From a paper:
Crystals were obtained in space group P4332 with one protein molecule in the asymmetric unit. The final p73 structure was solved using molecular replacement and refined at a resolution of 1.8 Å. The entire chain was traced with the exception of the three L3 loop residues from G265 to N267, which were not visible in the electron density. The p73 structure shows a conserved domain architecture, comprising a β-sandwich scaffold consisting of two antiparallel β-sheets.27 The DNA-binding surface is constructed similarly from the large L2 and L3 loops, the S10 β-strand and a loop–sheet–helix motif that includes the L1 loop, the S2 and S2′ β-strands and the C-terminal H2 α-helix. A conserved zinc ion coordinates the L2 and L3 loops (p73 C194, H197, C258 and C262) and contributes to the stability of the overall fold. The p73 structure also includes a second metal ion trapped at the interface of a crystallographic dimer formed by the H2 helix and the C-terminal His-tag. Unusually, a disulfide bond is observed in the p73 structure between C153 (S2′) and C159 (S3), although the main‐chain atoms remain similarly placed to p53 C135 and C141, suggesting that the oxidation has limited structural significance and is most likely the result of insufficiently reducing conditions during purification. As a result, p73 residues R201–A209 adopt a markedly different conformation to p53 C182–A189. Instead, the p73 insertion induces a loose helical turn that places N204 in the equivalent position to hydrogen bond with both p73 R193 and R216. The p73 DBD is the last globular domain in the p53 family to be structurally determined. Its structure reveals a conserved fold for DNA binding but a divergent L2 loop.
The p53 family of transcription factors comprises p53 and the paralogs p63 and p73.1 Under conditions of cellular stress, all three proteins are activated to induce genes necessary for cell cycle arrest or apoptosis. All three proteins share a similar domain organization containing an N-terminal transactivation domain, a DNA-binding domain (DBD) and a C-terminal oligomerization domain (OD).9 p63 and p73 contain an additional sterile α-motif domain and an inhibitory domain at the C-terminus.
Numbering used by the authors:
A (entry chain A), B (entry chain A): 112 to 264, 268 to 318
């Protein structure tokens, strides 16, 4: 059963790219991306957007999957899910139709597919690919992450984004580390400060 | 060679206790202790004090050793030392007589012994035990930690404090996790905030 989903960057025939729009630099920001650390910081259940770009359009019926995987060797074969206390509680579950066990939801998409793989047990969310507005650059996807990094037990998570044909064939792949808490702006500032401490230590 | 120094709490015949005086709650504090997380937060090369208490005085010639040990299983047999970039640089080394490879120094003590164990390679710092002022409660030891947590590569460190006879026999032992950065007050607040996120999740 315990497969590790493939992760390597794969630009593919359509030069699939995943980027992040410009983010607030405030301690109060609802999400923020650190280019320095290559880390996306978001808040539980709040909009956490990515930007997709392709160089030419993909074929008809293409989709985009998001699949979280734990990064550390001792966790990599464990399926990433909502923590049980969030899963069985009321918060963000009532009035919502997405399965409570899933970590990743998509906001603003009514053709979302929450997948629980029967063979691997991996959980992911798939949406159909939508091209950008005529003459514009990016397709935006609004994710919502439904647990904090503090919920388990931090265990770093990689979010693997794939461009996929209707038959499942991978046409592109990128990934990013996602960090979730009630103070993402503060976490960015602290991680960047700690990083800088050490980056001035090198000799020459 | 690769011994793991013994760590278990051992009050011993003199009920050896290690505590922390009241700390500033400011983001600007030079050191601070979290009773919630059981963590001491200090700054590189700055005073980082502990309080020793015994119920009756120990015997003549007794000493107190501080020995850092990495907490995580994959690091526990690695000797904890100053990172090489700090060790071979000028900062806090020039004008000072403590060996540059040592992580832990003692401030204000002129009988400090910097030990490099010939068999184990473990590095520690020993001072003679001094009783409190007549009719007072605590013996204070001023440590200075000479690398940031960011220096390696955080790798959590346990600081093991032992009360020892002249012959090396252990009369008492306690320990604490130490966290070192240029913003200890901020780290405390962030860790306590993240901790609280998760502590309200339990059911009943
Ligand atoms: Zn959770
Ligand atoms: Zn936070
Ligand atoms: Zn260092
Ligand atoms: Zn800090």
């Amino acid at each position: 059963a315990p497969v590790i989903p493939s992760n390597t960057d794969y630009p593919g025939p359509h030069h699939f790219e995943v980027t992040f729009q410009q983010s607030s630099t405030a301690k109060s920001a609802t999400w923020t991306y650190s280019p320095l650390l290559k880390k996306l910081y978001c808040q539980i259940a709040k909009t956490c957007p990515i930007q997709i770009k392709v160089s030419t359009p993909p074929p008809p019926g293409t989709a985009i999957r998001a699949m979280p995987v734990y990064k550390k060797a001792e966790h990599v074969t464990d399926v990433v899910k909502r923590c049980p206390n969030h899963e069985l509680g009321r918060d963000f579950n009532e009035g919502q139709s997405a399965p409570a066990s899933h970590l990743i939801r998509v906001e603003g998409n009514n053709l979302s597919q929450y997948v629980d793989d029967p063979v691997t047990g991996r959980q992911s969310v798939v949406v159909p690919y939508e091209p950008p507005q005529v003459g514009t650059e990016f397709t935006t996807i609004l994710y919502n992450f439904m647990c904090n990094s503090s919920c388990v037990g931090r265990r770093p998570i990689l979010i693997i984004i794939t461009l996929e044909m209707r038959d499942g064939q991978v046409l592109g792949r990128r990934s990013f580390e996602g960090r979730i808490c009630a103070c993402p702006g503060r976490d960015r500032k602290a991680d960047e400060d700690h990083y800088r401490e050490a980056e001035n230590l090198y000799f020459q």
